[PDB]
């Protein structure tokens, strides 16, 4: 089990994707999954350790490029919408 | 007299806004419409189609 890192988790064939964190939600014994409004799995019970983990997806957002005219200049600035600056992708991750 | 009337009218606006909860009906209605549209859009992911 890997927590606090975005992983391609496969809980009993759920084959989801997201970052796993410890959850304080108390699952009833007969239920092993937790959905939400969009009917996407939110919390799962570990089949081995029998602990409840929250599935929140990886940090995602839009990319806005602040540029003057190409005839004016060439430098650009990049805006990562609703993303904290502490987030640092060392490897290639989607845009750029 | 006119200054007192103006001050009393402003105070009455203060009181009416503070007491009546449905005073800001239009803005709350706009917010509710947008939130309901977003909630319906989210809930549409649960249908099989």
């Amino acid at each position: 089990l890997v927590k606090n890192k975005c992983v391609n988790f496969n809980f009993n064939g759920l084959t989801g994707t997201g970052v796993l964190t410890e959850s304080n939600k108390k699952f009833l014994p007969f239920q092993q999954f937790g959905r939400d409004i969009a009917d996407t799995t939110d919390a799962v019970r570990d089949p081995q350790t029998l602990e409840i983990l929250d599935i929140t997806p990886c940090s995602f957002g839009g990319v806005s490029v602040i540029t003057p005219g190409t005839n004016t200049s060439n430098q650009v600035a990049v805006l990562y919408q609703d993303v904290n600056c502490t987030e640092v992708p060392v490897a290639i991750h989607a845009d750029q | 007299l006119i200054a007192n009337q103006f001050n009393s009218a402003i105070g009455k606006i203060q009181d009416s806004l503070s007491s009546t909860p449905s005073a800001l009906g239009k803005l709350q209605d706009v917010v509710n419409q947008n939130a309901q549209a977003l909630n319906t859009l989210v809930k549409q992911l649960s249908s099989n189609f």
Partner: peptide, 25 residues
Amino acid sequence: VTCAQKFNGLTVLPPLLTDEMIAQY
């Protein structure tokens, strides 16, 4: 008049004019 944790591609862009700037106007 009365942040949502919507992760299905939905985001709320902040207004350009903050409430402080609107109050300053």
